[PDB]
């Protein structure tokens, strides 16, 4: 049970949650601040 | 543990890209019959494209300008065409218009730089050689050539305003595929650094960690490996077919051992 | 008209390496235990322009090299560009142009396959690849490019495909931009082949410690396969498990 | 406990310890 919980927590890190991509660096290096803020907000909400 | 250096590793390519072959092209294929020029096995400074003469629109949709240097792509597609001044805005992801829905539509997730500049001194007459579609019942698929009469000729005239003025537009379509990259740009491939927390940037594979010798039995077409958690663990160098392990820079928690402050103020750190 | 597919027609989904891992992915494969259309182009001759649909499987064993290439296209005429591949003992010819074919295209052992070459866009030349060695080729149209796989291995049963597993390796990735709707095998005239079809299916890919795909599981084959896919394992213990939902 | 092993366990303790099953950045 402990191992499965940890595995689920690790695997959840690769979800888009509606954003363009699940990689922070790509969003940082592909978008302007005004939209990147929204994308990062969405991603951090999901991870939280 | 903070990064200590900055490593750079790009394949054994030094020849300049034929960027001027399509950027300085005498004739540009019509927007409805646009050509797709594939550039590979070359290195070129994208700053010269950023700051070329008479350039008015150099925007990277899905890329950051001046960041293309540290990013190498397997193939770069150069789409050369001429449209109106008001039609340059339509060459972008998520944009709608005559060109964006009749002749040349970029994908909504476009990863590339759209380059345009005024060409009223070259493509003005009405210049009845450039043509754009004006009618269609639906929207074009991304990167598709579609060939009242829908195909209406351009009324490109020197007396026409900047909106109607002819503009040469070049689209650089970057494909970041798992195959080794060749369109690398101005990057001096640094020495392979071992046992140091360094930023990888292996042909633009952004990351950081410790690089050591690797013993994996890679297949010839495979460029990088992965772990059970879908985490990159090994990368093959583009120049020499050697794979290197990746270990993230060490970290942890810090705790302080202290007695009562009423006794003394000597502390120990773990 | 031998009718079987067994467990052949699985390629490496991507160039990503991985070792000692049980990975599941969604991609267009040939469904397991299906049946394929056994063919004999020349018995009497027939070279129908079979539809491309989503994907096409192909295999054959021969030594006389009667099979020399394929003819891909959308309208299969000179109105629009069509794809041509020719396998000769010297090199390989790729010509994707607006080609005007005749009534019976063939490689004269001359060029009677087409009447004129015009509006040529893509050309490529490399080492040649083409009565026991199977030569399987998976033809795919993904993201505006053309993809072909390859594998060579000897089999002593030519009329029927055998059992066993042999993963296919990637060969080419041609960014042609051609739309493909129908295709037809091209033969040289001075002849048995197969044609399957690819469908969106979920597969369980087992990767060896050397990075080789040694086993596969067709998830939607049967309830036991669904159970294996749910548990992400190749062995199922005694018990009762919930797999899916019914509506 | 048997005073002839690196760990001063018992036979039952050793069996129990053996009968159990066997990133981070
Ligand atoms: C999968 O990987 C394992 C490694 O963990 C491979 O086992 C070892 O493979 C190497 C090379 O394939 C073998 O070396 C060869 O051994 C023969 C024995 O006569 C020798 O004549 C050759 O000159 C060469 O040194 C090695 O023996 C082998 N180890 C064992 C214990 O068998 C395994 O072969 C890999 N599997 C596949 C299908 O590649
Ligand atoms: C090449 O480009 C330069 C500056 O962009 C320009 O001055 C020159 O006329 C061009 N040559 C051509 C278009 O042949
Ligand atoms: C098997 O062959 C029959 C014709 O005898 C056909 O109707 C059926 O669709 C085939 N099954 C598969 C899975 O292709
Ligand atoms: C032989 O192969 C070459 C490939 O380089 C091809 O151009 C040619 O048409 C083939 N046939 C003959 C008779 O040369
Ligand atoms: C290819 O032909 C199909 C016809 O079904 C058409 O829908 C599609 O837009 C065409 N694509 C290109 C790139 O010509």
For residue B143, give the nearest of C18, C144, C211 by CB distance: C144
| Residue C216 neighbours by CB distance under 10 Å | 16
Positive or negative: CA dihedral C232, C233, C238, C244: positive
For residue C18, give the nearest of B143, B223, B226 by CB distance: B226
Q: What is the DSSP string of B98-124?
A: HHHHHT----TT--EEEEEEE-TTTS-
| Chain B CB within 8 Å of residue A4 CB | no
Q: Which of C70, C69, C116 is nearest to C97 (CA)?
A: C116
User: CA C85 from chain center: how many Å?
Assistant: 14
Q: Which residues line ligand 3 (CB under 6 A)?
A: C 3, 31, 34-35
Token pair listed for B227: 């772990």
C91: Cβ below 6 Å to ligand 4?
Answer: yes
| Residue B207 neighbours by CB distance under 10 Å | 14
C145 vs C142: CA distance, rounded Å: 6
B153 vs B126: CA distance, rounded Å: 9
Work out how many CB contacts closer than 8 A connect B with D: 5
Those residues whose C-beta lies under 8 Å from the C-beta of residue C178, and which sit 6 or more positions away, are C72, C73, C74, C81, C82, C83, C96, C122, C146
* Subunit contact A29:B67, Cβ cutoff 8 A: yes
Cα separations in angstroms, B142 against B77, C60, C98, C164: 14, 36, 22, 41
Q: 3-state SS of C87-110?
A: ECCCCEEEEEECCCECCCCCEECC
- The DSSP 8-state label assigned to residue B158 in this structure reads T
Token pair listed for B254: 């810090």
Domain C3-247 in this protein, CATH class: mainly beta
C235 vs B121: CA distance, rounded Å: 73
Those residues whose C-beta lies under 8 Å from the C-beta of residue C113, and which sit 6 or more positions away, are C71, C84, C99, C101, C102, C105, C106, C107, C186
Phi, psi of B247 (to 5 degrees): -130, 125
Name where chain B breaks: residue before each gap, C-N > 2.5 Å: 125, 147
Token pair listed for B28: 């540009």
Write down the domain spans for chain C. Answer: 3-247
- The DSSP 8-state label assigned to residue B48 in this structure reads H
CA-only gyration radius of chain A, Å: 13
Q: Are C139 and C58 in contact (CB under 8 A)?
A: yes
- The DSSP 8-state label assigned to residue B28 in this structure reads -
Those residues whose C-beta lies under 8 Å from the C-beta of residue B166, and which sit 6 or more positions away, are B82, B83, B84, B118, B119, B120, B122, B123, B124, B127, B130, B154, B156
Experimental determination approach used: cryo-EM
For residue C15, give the nearest of B36, B77, B179 by CB distance: B179
Q: Match 């402990």 to its residue by tokens.
A: A2
Taking the CA of residue D22 and the nearest CA in chain B, the distance in Å comes to 17
Those residues whose C-beta lies under 8 Å from the C-beta of residue B253, and which sit 6 or more positions away, are none
Alpha-helical (H) ranges within B71-220 are 98-102
C101 vs C227: CA distance, rounded Å: 51
Q: 3-state SS of chain C?
A: CCCCECCCCCECCCCCCCCCEEEEEEEEECCCCCECEEEECECCECCCCEECCCEECCCCCCCCCCEEEEEEECCCCCCCCEEEEEECCCCEEEEEECCCECCCCCEECCECCECCCCCCCEEECCCCCCCCEEECCCEEEECCEEEEEECEEECCCCCCCCCCCCCEEEEEEECCCCCCCEEEEEEEECCEEEECCCEEEEEEEEECCCCCEEEEEECCCCHHHHHHHHHCCCCCCCCCCCCCCCC
B179 vs C53: CA distance, rounded Å: 27
Task: Quote the ligand 5 centre to C29 CA distance (angstroms).
Answer: 24
Q: Are C9 and C36 in contact (CB under 8 A)?
A: no
- The DSSP 8-state label assigned to residue B242 in this structure reads -
- The DSSP 8-state label assigned to residue A13 in this structure reads G
Task: Identify the burial level of B53 via C-beta atoms within 10 angstroms of its C-beta, where 0-12 means exposed, 13-18 middle and 19 or more buried.
Answer: exposed
Taking the CA of residue C227 and the nearest CA in chain B, the distance in Å comes to 21
B185 vs B46: CA distance, rounded Å: 7
Q: ∠C194-C196-C202 over CA atoms, to 5°?
A: 145
Phi, psi of A37 (to 5 degrees): -60, -45
Burial string for B245-254 (b: 16+ CB within 10 Å, else e) reads bbeeeeeeee
List the B35-39 sheet strands across, edge first: B35-39, B75-84, B166-175, B112-118, B55-61
Q: Half-sphere exposure (CA, 13 Å, Cβ side) for C191?
A: 14
CA of C31, closest atom in ligand 3: 13
Find chains touching chain B: ≥3 CB pairs under 8 Å: A, C, D
Token pair listed for B247: 């270990």
Q: Are B242 and B230 in contact (CB under 8 A)?
A: no
Q: Which of C66, C68, C25, C72 is nearest to C207 (CA)?
A: C25
Cα separations in angstroms, C67 against B92, C44, C48, C71, C108: 45, 17, 15, 12, 13
C20: Cβ below 6 Å to ligand 1?
Answer: no
Alpha-helical (H) ranges within B16-85 are 19-23, 47-50
- Ligand 3, atom 1: closest residue by C-alpha: C35
Q: Are C37 and C194 in contact (CB under 8 A)?
A: yes
For residue C211, give the nearest of B38, B217, B223 by CB distance: B217
C116: Cβ below 6 Å to ligand 1?
Answer: no
Distance from the first to the final alpha carbon of chain B: 16
Positive or negative: CA dihedral B60, B110, C202, C58: negative
SS3 A39: helix
Q: Is residue B233 within a helix (H) or strand (E), and if so which, with residue range?
A: strand B232-236
- The DSSP 8-state label assigned to residue B248 in this structure reads P
- Ligand 1, atom 39: closest residue by C-alpha: C210
Given resolution (angstroms):
3.1
- Out of C208, C210, C212, mutate this one to test ligand 1's pocket (max ligand atoms within 8 Å of CB): namely C210
Q: Are C227 and C241 in contact (CB under 8 A)?
A: yes
């Amino acid at each position: 049970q402990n191992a499965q919980a940890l595995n689920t927590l690790v695997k959840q890190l690769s979800s888009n949650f509606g954003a363009i991509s699940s990689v922070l660096n790509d969003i940082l290096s592909r978008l302007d601040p005004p939209e990147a803020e929204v994308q990062i907000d969405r991603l951090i909400n999901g991870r939280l | 543990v903070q990064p200590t250096e900055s490593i750079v590793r790009f394949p054994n390519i030094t020849n300049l890209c034929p960027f001027g072959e399509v950027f300085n092209a005498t004739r540009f294929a019509s927007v409805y019959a646009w050509n797709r020029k594939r550039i590979s096995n070359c290195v070129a400074d994208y700053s010269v494209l950023y700051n070329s003469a008479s350039f008015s629109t150099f925007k990277c949709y899905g890329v950051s300008p001046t960041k293309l240097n540290d990013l190498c792509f397997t193939n770069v597609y150069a789409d050369s065409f001429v449209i109106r001044g008001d039609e340059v805005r339509q060459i972008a992801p998520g944009q709608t218009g005559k060109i964006a829905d009749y002749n040349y539509k970029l994908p909504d997730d476009f990863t590339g730089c759209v380059i345009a500049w005024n060409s009223n001194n070259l493509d003005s007459k009405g210049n009845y050689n450039y043509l754009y579609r004006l009618f269609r019942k639906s929207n074009l698929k991304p990167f598709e050539r579609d060939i009242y009469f829908p195909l209406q000729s351009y009324g490109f005239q020197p007396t026409n305003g900047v909106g109607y003025q002819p503009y040469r537009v070049v689209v650089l379509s970057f494909e970041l595929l798992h195959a080794p990259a060749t369109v690398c740009g101005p990057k001096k491939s640094t020495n392979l650094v071992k046992n140091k927390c360094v930023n990888f940037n292996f042909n633009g594979l952004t990351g950081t960690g410790v690089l050591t010798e690797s013993n994996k039995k890679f297949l010839p077409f495979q460029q990088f490996g992965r772990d059970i958690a879908d985490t990159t663990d090994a990368v093959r160098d583009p120049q020499t077919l050697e794979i290197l392990d990746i270990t993230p820079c060490s970290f942890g928690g810090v705790s302080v051992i202290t007695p009562g402050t009423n006794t003394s103020n000597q502390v120990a750190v773990l | 008209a031998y009718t079987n597919s067994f467990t052949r027609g699985v390629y490496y989904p991507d160039k990503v390496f991985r070792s000692s891992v049980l990975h599941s992915t969604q991609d267009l494969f040939l469904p397991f235990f299906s049946n394929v259309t056994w063919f004999h182009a020349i018995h009497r001759f027939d070279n129908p322009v079979l539809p491309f649909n989503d994907g096409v499987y192909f295999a054959s064993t021969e030594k006389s090299n009667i099979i020399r290439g394929w003819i891909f296209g959308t309208t299969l005429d000179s109105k629009t560009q069509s794809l041509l591949i020719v396998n000769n003992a010297t090199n390989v010819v790729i010509k994707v142009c607006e080609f005007q074919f005749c009534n019976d295209p063939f490689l004269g052992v001359e060029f009677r396959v087409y009447s004129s070459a015009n509006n040529c866009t893509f050309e490529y030349v490399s080492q040649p690849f083409l009565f026991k060695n199977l030569r399987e080729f998976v033809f795919k149209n993904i993201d505006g490019y053309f993809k072909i796989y390859s594998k060579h291995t000897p089999i002593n049963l030519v009329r029927d495909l055998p059992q066993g597993f042999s993963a296919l390796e990637p060969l080419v990735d041609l960014p042609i931009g051609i739309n493909i709707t129908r295709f037809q095998t091209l033969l040289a005239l001075h002849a048995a082949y197969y044609v399957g079809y690819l469908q969106p299916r979920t597969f369980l890919l087992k990767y060896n410690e050397n990075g080789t795909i040694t086993d596969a599981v067709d998830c939607a084959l049967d309830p036991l396969s669904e159970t294996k896919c749910t548990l992400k394992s190749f062995t199922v213990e005694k018990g009762i498990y919930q797999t899916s939902n019914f509506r | 406990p048997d005073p002839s092993k690196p760990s001063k366990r018992s036979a039952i303790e050793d069996l129990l310890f053996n009968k159990v099953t066997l990133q981070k950045f």
